[PDB]
């Protein structure tokens with residue numbers, strides 16, 4: 001019986017996790033949902049608690065804490081431990097009844113909860129790519145100290161890569177470890193991209209695209225920030241750095257490939273040049289499920305892939321002139337140090353400015369480039385606590401520098 | 411160091427094996443070629459012996475035995491054990507200095523050498539699919555007796571399938587063992603086919619096709635028998651039965667898919683509905699190499715797959731009306747017993763009649779169909795020597811029956 005906590009259970013990752021858990025549990029009792037954690041969605045959490053009956057409930061916002069206590073009195077034969085804030089989150093991570101934690105929260109609370117899950121030697125199913133890009137050095141150090149802790153990737157391309165690896169090799173190492181690629185015989189990665197809504201657009205058309213164009217009739221309905229990142233291909237840029245950190249693959253050995261059908265989710269070339277790929281319909285339930293079942297798989301009732309119906313799969317190179325965010329991501333990754341932290345923070349601001357019609361498409365990459373050029377490399381702190389503060393200071397600095405650049409030109 | 415014997419070293423499989431061994435050994439000394447076995451080509455064997463310097467040389471034809479001995483006196487600092495016939499082959503299989511044996515011979519010598527390899531508890535890299543289709547029951551029985559022997563698939567689609575499996579699971583079972591699919595969490599197989607030279611012909615066009623049409627402007631350098639089987643899609647029919655026996659996959663869970671680009675070599679759907687596939691250029695060096703490195707991989711200098719250049723991958727269902735041999739293979743497999751033995755034997759005759767311009771395209775499937783209808787199921791011998799005799803007698807009967815049907819409706 002797999003004992004799982006869901007952090008951010010009313011978000012997209014959290015609700016997809018509970019859906020696949022429900023469906024798999026109908027086939028065979030595999031999962032025990034031990035904890036649910038949300039920001040402020042009391043009614044939604046109450047409804048989840050009535051179905052899954054977790055041992056723990058937690059809610060960040062303290063003004064709806066007593067409302068939650070009163071709601072759960074309506075549930076028959078059920079006496080949960082009801083907690084609140086960061087202290088509740090810490091108590092959940094330290095519980096001996098929890099084996100695996102799905103991190104479905106963004107920004108700092110994602111990183112903070114990941115930190116606590118690692119400190120308690122848990123399996124961490126991590127969907128927040130920005131935390132790996134920004135704080136990769138810190139997570140790597142924490143994983144070296146807490147030897148039984150593991151990060152298992154949920155980001156679909158990185159789940160795909162992970163699924164292409166031989167678990168007889170994977171089990172000798174773990175993600176975010178030096179020498180991961182060597183142990184797994186990895187030569188090179190094909191990192192698949194949908195390409196977003198702008199692949200056929202000219203440079204002159206790209207000059208005038210708006211956030212409405214990027215968000216209009218999405219093929220897959222996902223959040224605004226990632227949709228804008230998909231449009232600029234900064235999503236893939238961030239994912240290149242994520243690949244480097246998770247799998248210890250050199251930047252020269254990561255190739256972005258535009259695959260508009262989104263059936264092949266990524267591919268791994270091994271040292272003999274054989275290539276393995278993972279395929280399914282574009283659906284987050286498979287990557288989430290594998291993060292919770294690894295190193296095994298369990299039965300689902302998901303729709304089987306019909307390759308004859310799919311019929312055609314296509315691949316092409318992305319144009320770096322048209323999608324300069326990709327180039328900037330590689331440059332930041334290759335330069336190393338805290339340049340990925342700066343890239344991520346400056347993109348957070350630029351993405352949001354574009355979303356709100358404050359800047360143009362190529363201003364996104366212009367601002368990111370300028371902030372990157374404004375940063376000086378820093379000696380990397382050997383001390384774990386100093387290193388986290390260093391990352392947070394640089395993050396804050398880069399957001400401010402991006403905002404100042406905007407303000408001056410405006 | 412991996413100690414290898416090559417049976418049929420001057421055929422297509424043998425020459426590909428020695429090429430990839432040579433190239434891999436230039437990067438790192440991995441392989442010792444301990445034995446080479448050929449039918450007739452004494453001169454070619456001498457040249458191989460001069461380069462590879464194997465401890466054993468064997469030749470099936472006794473009339474060129476003395477010539478080989480005299481030739482080898484030319485090689486400096488070299489004193490091999492020089493053998494001939496079935497006896498020489500048995501002696502090679504029984505050597506404690508040999509770990510892995512590549513079976514690149516067909517027909518009787520192929521089944522015969524496979525048997526002796528298994529009896530001596532070797533790893534057997536098996537490229538002769540006809541042995542598995544005709545003698546699957548016997549090979550299963552033999553592998554149950556000889557617990558440390560293993561068949562590793564070399565046939566490209568079956569190697570692909572094998573490469574899509576997690577070795578943490580594969581190492582708890584072995585090919586041709588009951589429950590192989592259950593242990594590996596296999597739900598379904600996509601068995602990829604080139605479609606062959608007649609794939610786009612109308613029914614009227616198919617009625618007239620000749621063997622010269624099948625053999626003309628061939629895309630890859632392979633033998634006449636398999637080229638004719640590719641044209642009729644009986645190659646894939648045989649490979650369906652091969653999949654069933656190697657992997658214990660039910661016939662209803664094997665789907666033939668026409669993939670004309672021959673980049674994806676086959677795919678495995680797991681019980682969660684995630685699909686894994688193996689990809690490379692159509693080149694037999696990868697499947698051969700993997701059979702000799704499994705459960706590891708080693709470095710090659712093969713050309714890396716350029717997915718952007720490949721650009722497009724396509725998939726469609728084959729027409730059973732145009733390719734009735736596929737339907738016959740499923741029917742024979744599903745019926746079970748020795749019907750696969752009869753299918754293989756009757757196809758051997760019908761393929762050869764068509765190759766030599768004695769019958770038409772649809773006569774191939776007609777003869778096979780009639781022979782299958784003439785066969786009565788038999789009680790399966792419990793004794794392994796009786797079982798081998800039973801298989802061989804059914805094989806002879808079915809070839810004779812096919813020939814007599816040809817002679818009647820001449």
Ligand SMILES: COc1cccc(CCC[C@H](CC(=O)N(C)O)CP(=O)(O)O)c1
Nearest residue numbers: 156193194195196230235262282283284
């Ligand atoms: C909604 O579920 C899925 C599952 C798999 C694939 C897709 C297609 C969308 C792919 C990515 C979003 C992403 O980064 N993901 C999902 O990780 C968009 P781009 O950066 O253009 O490539 C959707």
Ligand SMILES: COc1cccc(CCC[C@H](CC(=O)N(C)O)CP(=O)(O)O)c1
Nearest residue numbers: 566603604605606630640645692693694
């Ligand atoms: C020359 O080497 C390779 C290597 C991989 C793939 C191909 C393409 C030819 C595929 C098969 C032959 C076969 O049965 N093989 C190779 O196992 C033909 P059909 O039955 O139409 O599908 C060639």
Ligand SMILES: [Mn+2]
Nearest residue numbers: 155156157239
């Ligand atoms: Mn992704």
Ligand SMILES: [Mn+2]
Nearest residue numbers: 565566567649
């Ligand atoms: Mn084949």
